[PDB]
């Protein structure tokens, strides 16, 4: 999940 949010940056 973290990676799916972190993509924003």
CA distance 5 to 2: 5
Q: Where are the alpha helices (DSSP H) in 1-9?
A: 2-6
Alpha carbon 5 to its chain centroid, in Å, reads 2
Burial 1-9 (b: 16+ CB within 10 A, else e): eeeeeeeee
- Structure resolution, Å: 1.0
CA distance 7 to 9: 5
CA distance 3 to 5: 5
CA distance 5 to 7: 5
Identify the experimental approach. X-ray
CA distance 1 to 8: 13
CA distance 4 to 6: 6
């Amino acid at each position: 999940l973290a990676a799916m949010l972190a993509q924003a940056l």
